[PDB]
Design a protein around this ligand. Structure first.
Ligand code: KYF
Ligand code: SAH
Length: 221
């Protein structure tokens, strides 16, 4: 629906936006750092479905936080659960400030990657959980499908892929304030299936203010 005229401007505009964003939890969420406690706890519950003892138990050795920010999700959610954690982001400033935000537990952060997801290729057979939260709006429909295709080959046995992002009620919403596109459940599930991934669980985050978009979590492998 003519979402992006010249995809180059899409990435360039968004990248410039986040360079001038304060490396605070409030800055990571566009001024909504007060919901970080709600998100983490529901992510904690949604993740236990595959961490609790069962038929195909997901490992606890390594995880990959995409987007990752200054390490908001890394610190509260991933780091307490997994041995080592990797992070990937396009804004170098956030990864530098992460070392102080994470602090003592940030020493177990194994790798810091500074590049865009459209160019990032995770190492194969490396991660048990690949967390992707609130970043998919900055990728094109084709790059998001190509990226998920690469993440499938980087998963360890029983590893999963988690996507937690904003979903529109009707239509594609272009949010030019940060150069991001918001999709509905249909377009997202088409891209997920187009990468060769299976839907394991789908849950909607509740207890969230009505002003923000609807938030859904997908479990893939
Ligand atoms: C809190 C939440 C969930 N919704 C919200 O407040 O929406 C407003 C509307 N608009 C202006 C401010 C935010 C973001 C954009 C949020 C914060 S940041 C974010 C995001 C989503 C997708 C991306 F690709 C990148 C960031 N979502
Ligand atoms: N095209 C892109 N490729 C890789 N990262 C991107 C990107 N566009 C935006 N980002 C990153 O995604 C984040 C947007 S919101 C950050 C959310 C963060 N994952 C969290 O813990 O809640 C910014 O940190 C920005 O650096």
């Amino acid at each position: 629906s003519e979402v992006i005229e010249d995809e180059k401007q899409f990435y360039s505009k968004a990248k410039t936006y986040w360079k001038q964003i304060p490396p605070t939890v409030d800055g990571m969420l566009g001024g909504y750092g007060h919901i970080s406690s709600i998100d983490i706890n529901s992510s904690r519950k949604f993740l236990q479905r595959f961490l609790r003892e069962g038929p195909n138990k997901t490992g606890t050795s390594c995880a990959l936080d995409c987007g990752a920010g200054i390490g908001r999700i890394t610190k509260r959610l991933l780091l307490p659960l997994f041995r080592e954690v990797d992070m990937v982001d396009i804004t170098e400033d956030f990864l530098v400030q992460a070392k102080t935000y994470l602090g003592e537990e940030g020493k177990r952060v194994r790798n810091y990657f500074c590049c865009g997801l459209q160019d990032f290729t995770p190492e194969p057979d490396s991660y048990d959980v690949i967390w992707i939260q609130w970043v998919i709006g900055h990728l094109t429909d084709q790059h998001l499908a190509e990226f998920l295709r690469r993440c499938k080959g980087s998963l360890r046995p029983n590893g999963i892929i988690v996507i937690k992002d904003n979903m529109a009620q009707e239509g594609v919403i272009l949010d030019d304030v940060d150069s991001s596109v918001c999709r509905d459940l249909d377009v997202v599930r088409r891209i997920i299936c187009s990468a060769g991934l299976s839907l394991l669980a789908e849950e909607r985050q509740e207890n969230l203010p009505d002003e923000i978009y609807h938030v859904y979590s997908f479990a893939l492998r």
